[PDB]
Design an enzyme around this catalytic site. Sequence first.
Site, short mmCIF file in Angstrom:
data_model
loop_
_atom_site.label_atom_id
_atom_site.label_comp_id
_atom_site.label_asym_id
_atom_site.label_seq_id
_atom_site.Cartn_x
_atom_site.Cartn_y
_atom_site.Cartn_z
N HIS A 128 -12.80 -121.17 128.11
CA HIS A 128 -11.41 -122.13 128.52
C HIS A 128 -11.80 -122.97 127.52
CE1 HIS A 128 -7.80 -124.52 130.28
NE2 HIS A 128 -7.76 -124.34 129.79
N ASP A 151 -9.52 -116.97 104.91
CA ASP A 151 -9.10 -116.46 104.19
C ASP A 151 -10.84 -116.71 103.08
OD1 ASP A 151 -7.69 -119.65 103.23
OD2 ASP A 151 -9.90 -118.94 102.87
N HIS A 172 -5.24 -130.37 105.74
CA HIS A 172 -6.38 -129.61 105.96
C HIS A 172 -8.03 -129.30 105.96
CE1 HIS A 172 -8.25 -125.09 104.44
NE2 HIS A 172 -9.12 -126.14 103.20
N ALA A 181 -4.92 -119.74 104.25
CA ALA A 181 -4.98 -118.33 105.39
C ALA A 181 -6.34 -118.87 107.03
CB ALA A 181 -4.41 -117.19 104.87
N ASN A 182 -5.55 -119.68 106.75
CA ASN A 182 -6.82 -119.75 108.31
C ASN A 182 -6.50 -120.40 109.45
OD1 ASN A 182 -8.28 -121.17 104.74
ND2 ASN A 182 -9.15 -119.90 106.17
#
Lengths: 131, 131, 131, 131, 131, 131, 131, 131, 131, 131
Positions: free
Chosen positions: J20, J28, J98, J121-122
């Site tokens: 958990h 990317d 980011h 794209a992460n």
Amino acid sequence: MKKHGILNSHLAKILADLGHTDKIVIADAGLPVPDGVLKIDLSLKPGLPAFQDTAAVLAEEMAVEKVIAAAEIKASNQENAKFLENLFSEQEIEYLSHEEFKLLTKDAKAVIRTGEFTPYANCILQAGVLF
Amino acid sequence: MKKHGILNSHLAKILADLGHTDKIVIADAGLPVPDGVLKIDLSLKPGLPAFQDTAAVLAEEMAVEKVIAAAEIKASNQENAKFLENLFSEQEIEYLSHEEFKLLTKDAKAVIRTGEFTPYANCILQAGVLF
Amino acid sequence: MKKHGILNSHLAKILADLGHTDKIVIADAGLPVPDGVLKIDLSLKPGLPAFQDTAAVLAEEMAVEKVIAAAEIKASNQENAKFLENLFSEQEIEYLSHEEFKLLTKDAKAVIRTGEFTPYANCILQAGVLF
Amino acid sequence: MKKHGILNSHLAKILADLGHTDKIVIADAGLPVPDGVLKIDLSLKPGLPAFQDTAAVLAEEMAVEKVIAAAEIKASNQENAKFLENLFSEQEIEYLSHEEFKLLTKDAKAVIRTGEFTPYANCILQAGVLF
Amino acid sequence: MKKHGILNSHLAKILADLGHTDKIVIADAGLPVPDGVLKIDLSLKPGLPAFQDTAAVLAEEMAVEKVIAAAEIKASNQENAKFLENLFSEQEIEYLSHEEFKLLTKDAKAVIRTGEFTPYANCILQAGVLF
Amino acid sequence: MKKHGILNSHLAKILADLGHTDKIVIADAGLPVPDGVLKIDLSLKPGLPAFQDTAAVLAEEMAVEKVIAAAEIKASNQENAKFLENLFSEQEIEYLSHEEFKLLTKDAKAVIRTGEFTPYANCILQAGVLF
Amino acid sequence: MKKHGILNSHLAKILADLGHTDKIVIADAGLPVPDGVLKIDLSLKPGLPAFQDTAAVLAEEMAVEKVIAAAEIKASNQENAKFLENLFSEQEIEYLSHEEFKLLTKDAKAVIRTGEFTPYANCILQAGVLF
Amino acid sequence: MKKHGILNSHLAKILADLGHTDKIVIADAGLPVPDGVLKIDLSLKPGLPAFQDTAAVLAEEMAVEKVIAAAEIKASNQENAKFLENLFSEQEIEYLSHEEFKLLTKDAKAVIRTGEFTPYANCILQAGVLF
Amino acid sequence: MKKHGILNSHLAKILADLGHTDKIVIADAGLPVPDGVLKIDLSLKPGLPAFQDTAAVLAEEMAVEKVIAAAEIKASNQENAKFLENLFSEQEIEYLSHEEFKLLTKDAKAVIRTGEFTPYANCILQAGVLF
Amino acid sequence: MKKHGILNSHLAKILADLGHTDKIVIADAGLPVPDGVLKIDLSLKPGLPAFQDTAAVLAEEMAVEKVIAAAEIKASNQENAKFLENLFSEQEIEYLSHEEFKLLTKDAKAVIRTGEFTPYANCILQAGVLF
Ligand SMILES: O=P(O)(O)OC[C@H]1O[C@@H](O)[C@H](O)[C@@H]1O
Ligand SMILES: O=P(O)(O)OC[C@H]1O[C@@H](O)[C@H](O)[C@@H]1O
Ligand SMILES: O=P(O)(O)OC[C@H]1O[C@@H](O)[C@H](O)[C@@H]1O
Ligand SMILES: O=P(O)(O)OC[C@H]1O[C@@H](O)[C@H](O)[C@@H]1O
Ligand SMILES: O=P(O)(O)OC[C@H]1O[C@@H](O)[C@H](O)[C@@H]1O
Ligand SMILES: O=P(O)(O)OC[C@H]1O[C@@H](O)[C@H](O)[C@@H]1O
Ligand SMILES: O=P(O)(O)OC[C@H]1O[C@@H](O)[C@H](O)[C@@H]1O
Ligand SMILES: O=P(O)(O)OC[C@H]1O[C@@H](O)[C@H](O)[C@@H]1O
Ligand SMILES: O=P(O)(O)OC[C@H]1O[C@@H](O)[C@H](O)[C@@H]1O
Ligand SMILES: O=P(O)(O)OC[C@H]1O[C@@H](O)[C@H](O)[C@@H]1O
Ligand SMILES: [Cl-]
Ligand SMILES: [Cl-]
Ligand SMILES: [Cl-]
Ligand SMILES: [Cl-]
């Protein structure tokens, strides 16, 4: 055999893992290497390979978005300092004191030792991105 | 810094451990390295460094009692074949087929990879003794 | 066999990696070695090899820009203290308290243990540069 | 500090593990060390330490039931050959060809490298038992 | 076989590396060993070997300049507390709370576990120097 | 703390992995240990622990279906040879020449070194099964 | 085979090294394991083995001095919360917030994962002493 | 980032070390990988990546001298069998029994697992030379 | 958490790498594990988990094409022998002497130890293919 | 072969150990991987496999309770940003700069590199619980 890319196998492995902002160092024969940092020594004899020849090969196999050198290079090593300016025209070139420079090498993915026997002939190449 | 001996750190470590009859290999860019044999890649780009440049530095830093090469070198790579004869004029030079040559590389302490892009540009240097 | 440089294989590997300002320690038989620091033990029996003999061999194989020693050596070991001042006449010699001296050994690349059975016969050799 | 036994830390660890019939090798600066065999290098410079000095220290710290040496030592190194015969007068001394001798070194627990620059100054000491 | 020094191979290796001020711990069967500290367990069954037997062998094989124990030993383990006073009559003995004692064990080169089944039967032996 | 089973932590780990037919060795202070075989040294001083005391503890913590000793024990060590017979009444006791005995130790999961200073005081305990 | 103690080899090894105050964790299938802490997964499928079954076995093979669980267990898993209370009647049971409980697991010698599929079915067992 | 060559870092490292005659294996999802051979799993789900997609990429980044596949592929996977024939028009394609094919994989530098869910969709690519 | 597949993390890792014909062993508490073979011990106490319970979970998470057991199981352990025949009715079941069975375990990717306390309760599951 | 769960063996091993709140990163082709974090590279060539394809498979094999992405994704990469919002509609999606996103990847159990050649794209997938 591998068709494309850099010829040196040790270097190919390092370039393969580069991500945006990762750094690698090209050093003269005297630069000390911090503990924990991979050292790939290409030196054969004094002046071979040359700082210039090594930096040139890396420039064409790696996407560089920023170059960092020691200020002392401008004065103590005019020929190599000019070479860098010329080679990395479109790249941001930042200068620091040799002391701060060495501190930065601790975060490098590797140090490439050349046979360069001239003062402050060292630089950090910061990886850019292909998109 | 180290004052004497070969400049390359990886190579210095190998020479440091050589005992009488131990073998090391200088190879062109295509020679396969047997599993378990340390590979030191000095290549930067095709032709750099050359087989000749590399072989000359090694002959300068280690006592060689015998040199082994592949017979196919005389036919396919005359220039380098002659360079060897001249460089190791005082040592014993033995030619085996490239096939036998490769089997022999399994006993090498290391294989030094050069940027040489010419056929059969490889040799085994067998350490001699200083007394 | 290796033609030039220091004869000891362990020491050759350490010298090969030395960069400007890196440090190595030459110690008597009692100096404690910090955890994580490589220890090369050359001792055979009390007094063999001696501090003087070891320091002399290293002085000729390594470029030293500075020597560091404990102030106490001037008090309890004048013999070796004079030897050191003479051997490194051209280099900068700094004296610190034995306590601070031990602290600095944590940053050494190696500690070379000799068979010296006299107090404070220890020194730190800081690597210089060949150009 | 350790009060008794051999002073060298590397050698102490090797002697500590010795069992009946285990072997260690004392070698000149040129003997090749088989792969997989631990190498303890005590050399500082040619002749230091000497074969005789090293062999003498080991003779007093280890129980030796047998000594093995190469027949060639009697021919090219009478000095050391006599030393050995005298030092181990009570022990069984066997002479083999240098070739067979090297083969046997593959079974040693360690090879102690001295600074001896004379031919065939090598011997194998086979551990005895204290009861 | 090794002729002199302590019989236990694991222990011989630790004593071999002791330098001035290095510490080792002799412990009862319940003392916790900090992470990163080598543990040598000599216990066979409750009471075998005893703290006293173990401490006496060590005092015989290593130069001890200072002994550290937990104050709680005087109250809860009189017999062993007195044994220590007698055994290390010439050395300096310092008592700390068992709490501080345990923190100190983090700097030990090793913890020797005995079969002792009595409270606070532990101590730190701090190596002295032979010259 | 662990409530049941053998007190020695190293031994507990070995017993925990025992399967039917696995073997462990109890050795005197002189038995050599084959390469690749784990050695747990319980020795403290000559005669401590004793072969008998060690074998007795193991007998009550491990299920033994067969004991193997060297024939020479019957003659050279009558007291310990009798001890074994007595202790392992219901177990199959096989005798071999000391030479074959040593060959078998290569397959042992571990060798337990005691402080026993008597000839051929060694034995191999072969694990049985609990169902 | 091993005659006494816990049956599981992995666990036997962990209990073997337990010292006073050392901690182990019994966990449900969802508890995260801190980096660095050894994980022993005994789960086969949901509910097998059960938290209760595992805690019972451990209570019988380990000397427990204190038990720690998350207060949330009283609110969402009263069944297991009651079990724990009864099983460790004579020991101290401390309730902390699940958040603090997790921070405490970083100090454990191991986390034992069960097949328990109910919330907060985790506990820390702190080792006691046998004397 | 790396400018040229294969995109996958794991694969770039494998191609970097390829020497003449070295072999790599492209495999379907069921091919067993011999012990000791490096496995690089690129599969995401059945059919992705496809055998064809992977072989195409490799053919473009590696100099292939010979291709080896199991004869069974012509019987049960004509589609992939045809693809292979066309992709390597200029190279030698050798068919062996699936059984011999598997024995050959033990000599590979790596096995690349794809998501291919069709029978015998495996092949061995033998490296050629760039001169 | 992982939504699908076997719950045990150790086993999940082994199943993940299974290729056609790879083998795994389910063992009773006494089966010896060959050196070099990974052992995953799921036992908690005698009879838990049972051979049957473990085999059932594996059959549901792994595609099996063949099962191998000792012949002695049919006579000395009728209950489990029947269970095996019933569980793997579709697959091929081969019976070998227990001695031959043990030799086969040398090739297993892992041995899963259960708490089963009945003789010859072992079997080898040979991986099939999903296409 | 494994019947259920994710097909990729490397990923299966990582999912197997998820607890958990544990986190994994899908990246990317340009995202840098912090030192110490396992990198599983599934890329074959630009765009293969795609970010979307990878995220979809993971969402189906892992219980996710929270997703974290860079804010810049909504503006600079609208297509994938929408996909993310749609795929994880039930879960909580948190947007960070980011820079802050990259700091969070230090705690990830692994970084899955895709062939995605579009910016930001992460995403981080935080493990939920099955009960
Ligand atoms: O040689 P100086 O100028 O003293 O110090 C700078 C040099 O030291 C090392 O860091 C590098 O080799 C650099 O060139
Ligand atoms: O060029 P061919 O004869 O085909 O193969 C020989 C070459 O392959 C490798 O062993 C070496 O690079 C050698 O030069
Ligand atoms: O001043 P102290 O530390 O007491 O004694 C100095 C000696 O202790 C060790 O450090 C060295 O052997 C040095 O010679
Ligand atoms: O007989 P060869 O091997 O030619 O010369 C013997 C010397 O070579 C090495 O083994 C040793 O150094 C020995 O002294
Ligand atoms: O017995 P108490 O005082 O509870 O705890 C002290 C013991 O716990 C461990 O540190 C040592 O074994 C020491 O003897
Ligand atoms: O001492 P001898 O009888 O010569 O040889 C047997 C001894 O050597 C070693 O294997 C054991 O220590 C055994 O007791
Ligand atoms: O299930 P919730 O209450 O959401 O979170 C608590 C669970 O998460 C993990 O720490 C443990 O598995 C515990 O049982
Ligand atoms: O599917 P069958 O024909 O039974 O066996 C061949 C397969 O088994 C493995 O070697 C490969 O995955 C190959 O595709
Ligand atoms: O019990 P016996 O028949 O003696 O030996 C067979 C047992 O030994 C081990 O291989 C297994 O545990 C098997 O059950
Ligand atoms: O492309 P810029 O915006 O300069 O930097 C963001 C990229 O750098 C890496 O973190 C990722 O690949 C991301 O896509
Ligand atoms: Cl050198
Ligand atoms: Cl000793
Ligand atoms: Cl136990
Ligand atoms: Cl590349």
